[model samples]
Target: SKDIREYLASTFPFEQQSTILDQLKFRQENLAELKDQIILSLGNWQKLLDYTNKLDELSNTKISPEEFIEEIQKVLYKVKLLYSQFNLSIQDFALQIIHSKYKSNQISQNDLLKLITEDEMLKILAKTKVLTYKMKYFDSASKMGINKYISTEMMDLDWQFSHYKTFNDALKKNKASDSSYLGWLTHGYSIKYGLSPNNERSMFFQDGRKYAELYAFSKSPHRKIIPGEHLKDLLAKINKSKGIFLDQNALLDKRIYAFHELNTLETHFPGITSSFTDDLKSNYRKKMESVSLTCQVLQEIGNIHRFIESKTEYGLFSIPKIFSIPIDYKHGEKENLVSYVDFLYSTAHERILQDNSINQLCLDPLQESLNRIKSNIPV
Candidate 1:
């Protein structure tokens, strides 16, 4: 309709006396076609609804199971046919509008694609696909047994009615802006996934200043009395120094500080560190070869912390005490160091098994350690 209006306006000069007459003619022609398409589409939808209602009514009657199955397949087939027909009519009408605009040079091929492939249309199509699957599932369940069939059918009917209401609303507001349509899609996805759209900000510290303070407090004992704004300033410093090859010890200290702070935050709020580990890893690996001895030990500790945090995020129940063993060889004997590494591998394996019965284990550190050990062992 918007395209149609644009085309009509383009056909008339502002000062022309016949401009109003041309507008009237264009409306009568194009709007009548649009009206016809809409009426036909609505009629098809009505037939679909009637078939579904008939199926519902038939279910209550004392009919043989075989007879009911046959009736259900028939109605399901008709419903699908009507659904496809309505979608095709809508697609054809939208394409006709685009093609008309292209012919008049009102829109280029790019514009044609952009205008036709709307998010709202995609959302409706996805909903239709889901409805199609439900229909097929309903048919299969009905053919299997009577009681299970009735139960599945009732659930499917309930979903159909709920989805139909949403679909009807979207159709009525079909001309809404693309952003509004995308927001509706985002809302739908969030509901399906048990997720919040603004979860990152809300689940973490309430504000950036508090986050900075907690982040700073968790890192340095000497800097425990730092002001909130000072922490914010440090965050800006960290952000600026991200990829540069600065004093490797200082950079590592900063990275380790952030890693420990993030770990403490995750411990305080379960599932909050899911989005932090990736950045930590990326920052830790920035200047891998330039790291000092203490920095290497801190990085390993950070890696272990990240590994535990990720597992906890994915339903792993507990972290072992052995995992907190410091990665310091200077203070420990050689045998004790070996035992510490062994404990690390053993704890990793134990946690992996506790998480599942399957052989799919999240044990990257163990694998990497084994590979390093293999490289060091004599042939």
Candidate 2:
């Protein structure tokens, strides 16, 4: 029992497993609890933006409490949608792969070169490019710095591990505890000291920062070229270049990782992208639609989280934003250096249906939040 509780802070979604290893998504009760959590995370009726002394000058814009609350509801809706989609994306991608028999190749590295079309390869590069632009944005904003978001105490590695334990073991060992104190609204905020997106944790705020690291190239001309004659020539070019994609660590130059990932995938299986079926092609296209929205939602979440910390007296940690950071989702569609979300709802939904252990983990917080919202009380 002590051992379970001892490591509660660090064990989750276990790393180092092939084929979706472990997937992350919010729970069903999350929707109901979201409203409550929104109330709690926000704590009291502070302005999402305070129009204090100096704000009076820029206070020309009209404000409505009702509309603002409604926008918050929308923000929660986006969270729900994001979890759904992220599961779907992961599902669609996984289904296409031949997971049943893992030791051989239906698609080869060579197949990627010969079978892939110019259009397909071009978009794959573009699709992959999404992560890079985002990392640049994240790097930009981290430089801007928020005065107080997560407490420094929480940021310390030991604290972070414990927080994860509490959160990870929420439905089990720590059922009586509130795991909401140190999460929500950040990837890097709670990220380990090393470089990682935490495997696309949180799926949009929680998820946004991760998928983002994988998308830098093609958008920026840093290294390696997808030179073309046909699909053959482009793949040839990638294969020829041994240094750019080979030498650099991913975080140092994520572009290198994109192709590193691209070719690596090709090495195991061929024709993944080149021989896309209509449904498969649609999955890539779905990403194009979903990713832009993911970026916007992340920025909105970031601003709200920042404002809640800087503008509010609540000291977000009072209850912790948890899975329910009350983002003002309907705000303008622009980002200030944030990342992105995806996957499928059905995939996640089915998962919840299949397992009670998972079901409780997903449902507990939602129920907790709902009760909290109903009572105007937070954990």
TM-score winner: 2
The TM-scores of all predictions, comma-separated, are 0.19, 0.22
lDDT of 2 by residue, 127-188 (tens): 22222223222342353331111122122122112222222233223321111111222222
Task: State each candidate's clash count.
Answer: 0, 33
Local distance difference test, per candidate? Answer: 0.34, 0.27
lDDT of 1 at 193: 28
Q: In model 2, where do residues sit more than 4 Å from their true spots?
A: 1-29, 36-229, 247-268, 271-379
lDDT of 1 by residue, 1-379 (tens): 2332343344222112111112234322432333333345562255544543453355334554335435544543342224454443332222233233344444344433343245444454433433333333333323222111121111212211233333324333553333223333332332232221123222222234544454445455345344455565544443444433222344333333333233323333223223266546654332221122222222233332332233222111112223332333332233332444455455445423221211211233335445654343221
Q: lDDT score, residue 307, model 1?
A: 29
Model 2 lDDT, full chain set:
0.27
